[PDB]
């Protein structure tokens, strides 16, 4: 619901959704948005659909399908270099989806925008050092850049307070034509605890595990750490629920 609410942010301003201990359905998210592009790194997409991890991180932003190749850790493209970075060590599943016309409560941004370059000038005006985005972190030059970039070619500069470092921070704003249908890119990073897997896919009771299906049959019961051989019979409720 938070992903659906309001409008998707730009790739540099990507919002972060964190799920630690809840049942999750990949199919429900796929139903909400038709997935134009599906890819995963370090694990199968089917495995990601049905597995338990210590934590689930979802990053949601409005990204066009045309520049999807540029936004890759392997890719040397500027958009990945200066905007959004996904940690290589955790398995990362990257999904690009296009909003359906039927879906409502989704607001299209005026245009898709990205930080073309992020750099910091040194104390010497002649010497400049480029700044490369660390994994996530919402981008180093995001503060200078506005949430939506007004022009395809833009110059943003701000002055660092002296000590430290007293060096100008320079950012570039670039935009691409808005698609007739909003396209949103989602980056998912999953962390697995060796002894802890709190977030799990939605669980539906199997017929054999359910007491009602095996009623009237001698069976072995293992409920809440209690193990015994017994026959369950449906009857009027007695005792305290």
């Amino acid at each position, epitope marked *: 619901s938070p992903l659906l609410s309001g409008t998707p942010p730009q790739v540099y301003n990507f919002k972060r959704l964190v799920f630690t201990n809840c049942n999750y359905n990949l199919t429900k998210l796929l139903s909400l948005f038709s997935v134009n592009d599906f890819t995963c790194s370090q694990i199968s997409p089917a495995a990601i659909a049905s597995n338990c991890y210590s934590s689930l991180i979802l990053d949601y932003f409005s990204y066009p399908l045309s520049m999807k190749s540029d936004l890759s850790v392997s890719s040397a493209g500027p958009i990945s270099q200066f905007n959004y970075k996904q940690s290589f060590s955790n398995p990362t599943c990257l999904i690009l989806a296009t909003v359906p016309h039927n879906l409502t409560t989704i607001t299209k941004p005026l245009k898709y925008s990205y930080i*073309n*370059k992020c*750099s910091r000038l040194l104390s010497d*005006d002649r010497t400049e050092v480029p700044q490369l985005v660390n994994a996530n972190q919402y981008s180093p030059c995001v503060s200078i850049v506005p949430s939506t970039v007004w*022009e395809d*070619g*833009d110059y*943003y*500069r701000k002055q660092l307070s002296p000590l430290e470092g007293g060096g100008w921070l320079v950012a570039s704003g670039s935009t691409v034509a808005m698609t007739e249908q909003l396209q949103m890119g989602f980056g998912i990073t999953v962390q697995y605890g060796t002894d802890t897997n709190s977030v799990c896919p939605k669980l539906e009771f199997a017929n054999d595990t359910k007491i009602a299906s095996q009623l009237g049959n001698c069976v072995e019961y293992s409920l809440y750490g209690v193990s015994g051989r017994g026959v369950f019979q449906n009857c009027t409720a007695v005792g305290v629920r």
Partner: antibody
Amino acid sequence: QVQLVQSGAEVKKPGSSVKVSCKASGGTFSSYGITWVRQAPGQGLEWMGRIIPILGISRSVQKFQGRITITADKSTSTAYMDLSGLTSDDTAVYYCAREGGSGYDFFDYWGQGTLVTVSS
Amino acid sequence: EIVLTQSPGTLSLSPGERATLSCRASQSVSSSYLAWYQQRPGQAPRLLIYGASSRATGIPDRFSGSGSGTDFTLTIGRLEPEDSAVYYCQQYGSSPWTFGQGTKVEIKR
């Protein structure tokens, strides 16, 4: 504060590439954009293009697109604009102006200027 | 690109008399996004007002900047022979930024 100077006035045939060079005295370039303005005699100034040497980005006005190539080298500390296949009517004084940024599009300092003449 | 109306231009003004220059805009432009440039004959233009309010550094407060959104007026409290020049109002709110048609102040001692 960086002083702005421009190349001496030059005369070229129409359809012949002409380069106007703007330089900063002391061979030092600050983190400021260089903007090229063409003023026709007795006419309003026209902004041909905006380039930032430190950023390395290049931008041009719609009217002057695909006929002008603008190159600014931060290390050189000199910004030079090349105009190719310009019309005879294009002859005008050319100015280079310091740019605060997209947020602040005003020019604190202006170059002395170069007269460009295109008569065969 | 915004088409902008300008003051008629050449005027006979006595020294010490306030002078007002009109810069109406056909299309609305940001109040904080306008610039005033003064050029002497055979001289490059120099910024007088940035943002249509604050004076540029090294520029006398007499050339005050007033007006917002559509009409921008440059008012000079005291007129001097040095003051006489061509004045252009540039609106940078919309790109391409459009310079003023220009207006000429004439001072005869």
